[PDB]
Structure 1
């Protein structure tokens, strides 16, 4: 923000050479404070009265402590402070007089002072003893009770040891003082008057100039950001909504740092957090069964699907069970089902959560059974005492949506093979994305290759050569046997995360099984809150799909980290046919970028398949062929625009030579648009293209010479028969 505002460069170098001398006499930091305080200074010409663009009613004369004395005679002022939200200093100058009896400029000082006062040390950080114990110098510390140069009608009260007891009742007054110690410590004339009369205010002001000013100007600066930031609960306040097991999260905290790369996780079910710290394995790609959120089984992947969230969905369960069955049918020996065994803690946990209610006991076939209660009205559950297994049955007076009725059976859950032993399954750590530092990717490339590349003689080839390298070793993502789809580093990262939550004590395998959701091109999901662990090791969690996007733009995108976003964004994800939006820079600049040959023909093809009617039919009509012949003409111009030999020219020419090529195209379009009958679906597209071209050519023009409006420049063209001289015209048209 530029602080000074000189509004009418009316006088020669005098009004100027005066505002300057004025300002330069003020400390470069006092301004900094003013600036950070969102302040602005107005040095307008001759604008005395309630006349400046900012001098009409806002937060003016309400009460009267005004100048070095309270006087309050407005029409006579030449300096003023808009005092509330953002400070607004306004000064004006007429002819040469501020230096003889600077007893005047001293107001441009206090008038200024009334900015820092209630927002300086006096109160900004609170009167910290620094300013309090300085005010104690009323008359009891130093042998200098010489404070009339700042304290008359509000401090002839020497008969008060001024301390916390009363200093507040008169902040507006203990400011008028800070406004003189300032007006005096800097006034172009009287400065020692402050070092003589009061020995403290001086040293105070003086130590303020020694750096006290750079202080507040830095506690306001740092808070400059922390103040206006992106609302994202950090610390464990997030680690809670996260879902991750705090031990693991902390474990991750290392890698993020060592490797220097952000880590983002989608929500990890609460109902599965401890099932993890516990030792329960996590769901991979091998299982597409649904979890559950209620009853004993909650947090597990019940082989029985009517015991998972989709409780009732006669088809989500119908086709639901069909999934576990396959999960086991295909990936046998690795995936299967095992009896549910709610341990101790878990029980006491599903407790307050209200998932279950442990109550009355019972006896069957000789074994003890504490009965596990759940409000579900179709299944009854009981846990075993010898082994604490869990069982259920379709109540004596009810049925199962699929049409099943069974007596006390064991609750099987899904379990993958870990170290040769089926372990129950629960939610895994789904990475939303991984943002490694651009420089860490550099370390990915093999010294020699990247070497053999920079040596290249051709400059533009070097670039290409590099970009690929960066694509080759950092952006490319190949599929994979198990870990889904991910990049090589993405994999290495995957291990360092797992072996990291392994040395913590987890005994159930990995917790991050597949690649990053930014590759979930098939069935992309859109989670609101995303847990992130920056390279510094600070937990964070967003609240919006927007905030996330906004966060990633500020920190990951615009900050030297490699990040790419789900290829299905802004498109229509096939699988779940979902439309999930993500700001795409490229598409931003589309609005004013002339289409390409191929981008053009592409769009034609699309519409053809949409209205089963093409820009031109395969007929005998000779006006049809005209249309064909004519699009082929645009498909040319557009193709001509993007010519690689455009380098053997100069930026000047480039624009021109292209502003024409572009114009050419704009024509044939305007041409066809006025042809025979062309389906309106196309009529519109061509309409769209026009604006692009227009927009583009405008850009090329304002970039170089400003007045020429596209519409006008067009008019002045002769596209009848000869194009030749028309181009020579175009040139002259631009002068």
Structure 2
């Protein structure tokens, strides 16, 4: 954002040693106000007229109230402000004299003035009483009714009080003032002419120079960020789609701050939000049953699957039931089914939600049943009175998709053990990710170990010793029998989350059961909205997989917090065979990196297992072996590229010795690529491996002497029989 652009360095100093003199005059802050309003100042040679590469027809001259007073003969100007979006001050000079009759350089101030002004205290925030009153100094305050400088035509209206009644009207007139006011306070000659003829505006400008220019230069710098940002609907406006329960979120708001670590959750279904506050325990890993979003059960894991979202999916439900059964079968005493008892508040909730309709009553065997209604067309529901249990049955003119038909039975739901008591289950807090600050991980490391590592001689082993430490105590994730796959701190932080939501008033046990979806390598899922609770307290809820990505990049990744992303990203995860995209840097730099021995051999084995033919077949064709031999040769050059002994050399050399080792590779590639009928699949690959090398050598070139384009440097080589001088050649070729 260089604010001042000097077009022509034509003349010697004079032009320069003049533009400077002009700028060193104006306050370093008034400028920053400019370089904030996105302004730029232009000092061109003699482009006087509409010649400025930025002076043609955009938003030019519409209504004539130009200079101090007025004149408007454009063609005769040397100073101008491109009035409309970003401010653009364009100015030029010819010969020496400006001081004599500064009546000239004074316009570089007003001519400027029309820049900050209207966006300055005079009107940005509004004509705040500060300038709303300085305006009043027409003739009411001090015995100084001397303003025959800026109020000749537009304000010879002494007979009309100047407060709010009419100041809006001609905001521009009170501009023609902040202008000549500025021009007079900073002009190189008349400074006191604005300390005499105007008793207060001097003080205004002065107060402004005092620090008033640093003012807006901060109420703008701040709205500099807060403006162009990443839409995220923070505050309880988010905590509303979060699903999370306010006492909990707010509860979490303490942990983020104490341990300085972002917390991100996927979305907790709304039809569970309260069941959670209500005290219903949450679904762990043991249960793989489907929740539901309708009827009386909604928010519970209906032991019966044809009563959960997947209503009708004869096989999803089929396999669905089969899932709760094992959930219990295998993990028993902890996982089972208990009757659905919709407490008080709950009913009124599924009511104003439309999930259920409470109406007519009825009698049966002696007990009362308010009959609960729901537009489901196969099952009917009624809720007991004694105990508020619930029941359903197949309507007398329908059946269960699986092929079942039954009379009034209670609705059991899945429930896990909780202090020896099968409590019902609802959605849990599935963390999407945990971003502890790097500093918080150092605290995770045991002083002795770290010490034993930094108190080393090898400047490089040190780094290694450290990274492993940072890997060991912070990035590593081992699997757990209980909590899925997760880091160790991930766990400590995991308990502290629950404890926090239990030292509040939760009696359903734990609300965060497993680790972070960033380890759900098998069945990873893509959620648009992600609730995040910053290290300080603000709640946030991104809107796009990207925004989330974009957020995390700005606030987490490149900001001193340790984050890692789902390994199955950019790949094709097995479990659900879903491809989930995430910006990976290392990949952003592959396009320019010579591959590796093994990175190469890998991509072969790849193609082999597909089109079942290798770069070389197990035959006697001495032409085939020609090929075999030849790849073994590429898998050498490449292997030679990445030689760690390259250190006993020096940057310049490295770049060279490498551009060659590199080239060597690119060559035998050109070779095979023109060899015998290597499957068209490998044809391409190699064609890809070329661009790489290429890109890689250009890079290593633009770091030193770069006019030579890879394509050209190539020609000049002789890869015929001898290899010797070739390099000696290459050398000179790059000097």
TM-score of the aligned structures, taking structure 1 as reference length: 1.00
State the shift of 1:84 in Å.
Answer: 1.1
Aligned: 1:17 with 2:17: yes
Question: Counterparts in 2 of 1:44-123, with a 5 A limit?
Answer: 44-123=44-123
Aligned: 1:238 with 2:238: yes
- CA offsets, 1:139-182, max 9 Å, x none? 00011000011111010000011010000110111100110110
State the shift of 1:354 in Å.
Answer: 0.3
State the shift of 1:292 in Å.
Answer: 0.1
What SS does structure 2 have at the residue aligned with 1:358? strand
State the shift of 1:535 in Å.
Answer: 0.4
- CA offsets, 1:692-724, max 9 Å, x none? 000000000011111000000000000000010
In structure 2, C-alpha distance between the alignment counterparts of 1:48 and 1:563, rounded to whole Å = 56
- CA offsets, 1:627-685, max 9 Å, x none? 00000000000000000100000001000000000000000000000001000000000
State the shift of 1:416 in Å.
Answer: 0.1
Question: Counterparts in 2 of 1:242-261, with a 5 A limit?
Answer: 242-261=242-261
In structure 2, C-alpha distance between the alignment counterparts of 1:386 and 1:275, rounded to whole Å = 21
In structure 1, C-alpha distance between the alignment counterparts of 2:83 and 2:246, rounded to whole Å = 48
State the shift of 1:451 in Å.
Answer: 0.2
In structure 1, C-alpha distance between the alignment counterparts of 2:338 and 2:552, rounded to whole Å = 42
2:697 corresponds to? 697
What SS does structure 2 have at the residue aligned with 1:353? coil
State the shift of 1:122 in Å.
Answer: 0.8
State the shift of 1:97 in Å.
Answer: 1.4
What SS does structure 1 have at the residue aligned with 2:713? helix
Gaps of 5+ in 2: none
State the shift of 1:444 in Å.
Answer: 0.3
State the shift of 1:42 in Å.
Answer: 0.1
What SS does structure 2 have at the residue aligned with 1:47? coil
In structure 1, C-alpha distance between the alignment counterparts of 2:652 and 2:721, rounded to whole Å = 28
- CA offsets, 1:466-507, max 9 Å, x none? 000000000000000110000000000000000000011000
State the shift of 1:351 in Å.
Answer: 0.7
State the shift of 1:352 in Å.
Answer: 1.2
State the shift of 1:133 in Å.
Answer: 1.1
What SS does structure 2 have at the residue aligned with 1:499? helix
- How many residues were matched structurally? 735
The list of structure 1 runs, each at least 4 consecutive aligned residues, that deviate by more than 6 angstroms after superposition, is none
In structure 1, C-alpha distance between the alignment counterparts of 2:51 and 2:660, rounded to whole Å = 51
State the shift of 1:385 in Å.
Answer: 0.5
1:539 corresponds to? 539
State the shift of 1:447 in Å.
Answer: 0.1
2:618 corresponds to? 618
In structure 2, C-alpha distance between the alignment counterparts of 1:498 and 1:603, rounded to whole Å = 46
| Higher relative helix content | 1
In structure 2, C-alpha distance between the alignment counterparts of 1:545 and 1:500, rounded to whole Å = 29
In structure 1, C-alpha distance between the alignment counterparts of 2:178 and 2:151, rounded to whole Å = 11
In structure 1, C-alpha distance between the alignment counterparts of 2:406 and 2:537, rounded to whole Å = 52
What SS does structure 2 have at the residue aligned with 1:703? coil
What SS does structure 1 have at the residue aligned with 2:362? strand
1:717 corresponds to? 717
What SS does structure 2 have at the residue aligned with 1:263? strand
In structure 1, C-alpha distance between the alignment counterparts of 2:116 and 2:40, rounded to whole Å = 13
2:340 corresponds to? 340
In structure 1, C-alpha distance between the alignment counterparts of 2:39 and 2:148, rounded to whole Å = 31
In structure 1, C-alpha distance between the alignment counterparts of 2:65 and 2:518, rounded to whole Å = 62
What SS does structure 2 have at the residue aligned with 1:298? coil
Gaps of 5+ in 1: none
State the shift of 1:40 in Å.
Answer: 0.3
In structure 1, C-alpha distance between the alignment counterparts of 2:271 and 2:85, rounded to whole Å = 47
State the shift of 1:625 in Å.
Answer: 0.1
State the shift of 1:607 in Å.
Answer: 0.1
CA RMSD of aligned residues (A): 0.4
2:154 corresponds to? 154
- CA offsets, 1:556-605, max 9 Å, x none? 00000000000000000000000000000000000000000000000000
In structure 2, C-alpha distance between the alignment counterparts of 1:212 and 1:605, rounded to whole Å = 69
State the shift of 1:241 in Å.
Answer: 0.5
State the shift of 1:116 in Å.
Answer: 1.2
- CA offsets, 1:40-93, max 9 Å, x none? 000011110000000001100000110001110011000000011100000001
In structure 2, C-alpha distance between the alignment counterparts of 1:245 and 1:184, rounded to whole Å = 61
In structure 2, C-alpha distance between the alignment counterparts of 1:348 and 1:289, rounded to whole Å = 26
State the shift of 1:344 in Å.
Answer: 1.0
- CA offsets, 1:281-331, max 9 Å, x none? 000000000000000000000000000000000011000000000000000
TM-score of the aligned structures, taking structure 2 as reference length: 1.00
In structure 2, C-alpha distance between the alignment counterparts of 1:674 and 1:563, rounded to whole Å = 46
